Amino acid sequence: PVWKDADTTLFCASDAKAYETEVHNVWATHACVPTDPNPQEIHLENVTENFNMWKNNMVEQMHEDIISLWDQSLQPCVKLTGGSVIKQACPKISFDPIPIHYCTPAGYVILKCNDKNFNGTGPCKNVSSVQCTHGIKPVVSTQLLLNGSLAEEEIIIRSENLTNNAKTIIVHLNKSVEINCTRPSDIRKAYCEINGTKWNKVLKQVTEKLKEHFNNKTIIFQPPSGGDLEITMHTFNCRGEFFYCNTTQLFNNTCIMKGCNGTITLPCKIKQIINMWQGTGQAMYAPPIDGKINCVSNITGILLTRDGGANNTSNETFRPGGGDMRDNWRSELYKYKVVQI
Ligand SMILES: COC(=O)N1CCC[C@H](C(=O)Nc2ccc(Cl)c(F)c2)C1
Ligand SMILES: *[C@@H]1O[C@H](CO)[C@@H](O)[C@H](O)[C@H]1NC(C)=O
Ligand SMILES: *[C@@H]1O[C@H](CO)[C@@H](O)[C@H](O)[C@H]1NC(C)=O
Ligand SMILES: *[C@@H]1O[C@H](CO)[C@@H](O)[C@H](O)[C@H]1NC(C)=O
Numbered sequence: 001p002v003w004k005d006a007d008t009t010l011f012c013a014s015d016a017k018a019y020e021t022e023v024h025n026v027w028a029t030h031a032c033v034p035t036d037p038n039p040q041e042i043h044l045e046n047v048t049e050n051f052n053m054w055k056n057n058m059v060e061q062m063h064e065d066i067i068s069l070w071d072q073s074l075q076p077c078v079k080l081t082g083g084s085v086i087k088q089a090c091p092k093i094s095f096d097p098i099p100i101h102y103c104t105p106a107g108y109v110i111l112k113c114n115d116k117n118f119n120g121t122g123p124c125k126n127v128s129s130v131q132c133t134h135g136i137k138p139v140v141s142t143q144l145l146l147n148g149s150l151a152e153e154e155i156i157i158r159s160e161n162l163t164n165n166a167k168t169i170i171v172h173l174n175k176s177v178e179i180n181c182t183r184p185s186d187i188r189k190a191y192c193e194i195n196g197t198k199w200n201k202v203l204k205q206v207t208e209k210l211k212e213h214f215n216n217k218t219i220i221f222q223p224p225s226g227g228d229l230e231i232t233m234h235t236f237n238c239r240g241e242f243f244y245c246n247t248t249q250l251f252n253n254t255c256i257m258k259g260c261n262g263t264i265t266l267p268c269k270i271k272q273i274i275n276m277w278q279g280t281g282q283a284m285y286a287p288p289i290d291g292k293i294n295c296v297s298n299i300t301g302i303l304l305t306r307d308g309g310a311n312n313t314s315n316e317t318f319r320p321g322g323g324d325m326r327d328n329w330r331s332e333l334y335k336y337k338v339v340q341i
């Protein structure tokens, strides 16, 4: 059919409800068009196409969208940016992500890799074309990727360069793991419950898959090596509240029989004052709503950074990472790319 690699401005589509006060719905109601009522995916016969999830302008575009959404939607009591501050009103909002589709304009199409074990870079042999991506939830989080899609076959390790330890690793799970987080009815104290059995089994498999890529070496997990709390903790937004959860128990190493196939309870705190993931500085929000604040989510992936300086050692050490939300969008946009017809 003839196409070439190209960049261009996308638009978005949604099933947002015009009658909803939820912020993602409000934003998508006025910034996206309705979802394609009859989506058509066209398989491309005997077509091999190179992809590179690490060099994908769709990622930067979605990133700019979600920045826009959060800036219009979240109302901090005070926000400190660029040697300045502005104080406002900060009402509690309705907050629950909805899927967003990304669609090409005229003269362009989206190619979709359906190779089940595709790692994000290189050739894809089973390629289709679509007018829009599937609906992607823009879930902001560190350490754990939440409410995403799953790898269809095996656990996938995605990295721009595994030998470069400064390059973030995205682990794509093939089996979701529930994380159930609650502030019951100290108002800022909360906790997350994870099935230890389910989690440790998944984690043992992740270690095995990491061993395949690192010449059979010993794989050890460690807590983050300092930084801001947003990256030292699993950080996410739950119904408008910013949860900071300690994941030391998640990355034990011991449980990979010692009394650890029960429930894992991670200590959390709701924080009013955060370091924004947009990079702009510090923001302060209002105290949490009264009553039971609950969010149950699927762990669909893991963000990891590997220690340096272990070349002459027998081990490789991995720590939960994150903070660059582009990697969150990357973990869902990896199989898409825009081409010009
Ligand atoms: C990594 O380098 C940076 O520029 N950062 C500055 C310090 C951490 C910040 C961050 O990740 N904040 C955040 C806020 C809210 C949520 Cl719900 C979240 F999941 C992450 C990113
Ligand atoms: C991804 O697959 C390509 C082969 O097409 C290979 O060059 C690259 O090392 C792989 N990356 C990872 C992280 O497995
Ligand atoms: C090609 O990908 C399609 C679309 O996901 C999928 O049904 C299947 O795995 C592949 N089909 C063939 C004939 O290989
Ligand atoms: C979590 O995963 C299960 C199956 O793995 C799925 O049925 C459920 O809808 C998922 N929840 C969300 C919020 O995606």
Ligand SMILES: *[C@@H]1O[C@H](CO)[C@@H](O)[C@H](O)[C@H]1NC(C)=O
Binding pocket: 152, 153, 154, 155, 156, 174, 175, 205, 209
């Ligand atoms: C997930 O992938 C691993 C290999 O990485 C495999 O051993 C396991 O059976 C897979 N699980 C499912 C449910 O497909």
Ligand SMILES: *[C@@H]1O[C@H](CO)[C@@H](O)[C@H](O)[C@H]1NC(C)=O
Binding pocket: 161, 162, 163, 164, 165
């Ligand atoms: C990957 O990183 C290593 C170490 O930083 C570097 O020597 C190598 O050239 C990199 N590979 C590519 C393809 O950039």
Ligand SMILES: *[C@@H]1O[C@H](CO)[C@@H](O)[C@H](O)[C@H]1NC(C)=O
Binding pocket: 180, 181, 182, 193, 296
């Ligand atoms: C989540 O945890 C809360 C508090 O522990 C509990 O009331 C609720 O039943 C749990 N929900 C699920 C879906 O497991």
Ligand SMILES: *[C@@H]1O[C@H](CO)[C@@H](O)[C@H](O)[C@H]1NC(C)=O
Binding pocket: 194, 195, 196, 197, 198, 261, 262, 263
């Ligand atoms: C963990 O998953 C097992 C299945 O392996 C299930 O029977 C049980 O409900 C779960 N236990 C906890 C404590 O979540």
Ligand SMILES: *[C@@H]1O[C@H](CO)[C@@H](O)[C@H](O)[C@H]1NC(C)=O
Binding pocket: 215, 216
């Ligand atoms: C890693 O060790 C396994 C046995 O545990 C072996 O089958 C495999 O050949 C080794 N890795 C590679 C890349 O050969």
Ligand SMILES: *[C@@H]1O[C@H](CO)[C@@H](O)[C@H](O)[C@H]1NC(C)=O
Binding pocket: 232, 233, 246, 247, 248, 249
């Ligand atoms: C997480 O909890 C452990 C104890 O389980 C504690 O030593 C550590 O300081 C906590 N992490 C942070 C960032 O406070």
Ligand SMILES: *[C@@H]1O[C@H](CO)[C@@H](O)[C@H](O)[C@H]1NC(C)=O
Binding pocket: 248, 249, 252, 254, 255, 258, 259, 260
């Ligand atoms: C898991 O986490 C902590 C280590 O700080 C501890 O409660 C426990 O002994 C560890 N290992 C096992 C097998 O439970």
Ligand SMILES: *[C@@H]1O[C@H](CO)[C@@H](O)[C@H](O)[C@H]1NC(C)=O
Binding pocket: 096, 097, 139, 146, 147, 236, 237, 238, 239, 294, 295, 296, 297, 298
């Ligand atoms: C994940 O999805 C569930 C169901 O859609 C929702 O209740 C939960 O709040 C979501 N988690 C996050 C962190 O958005």
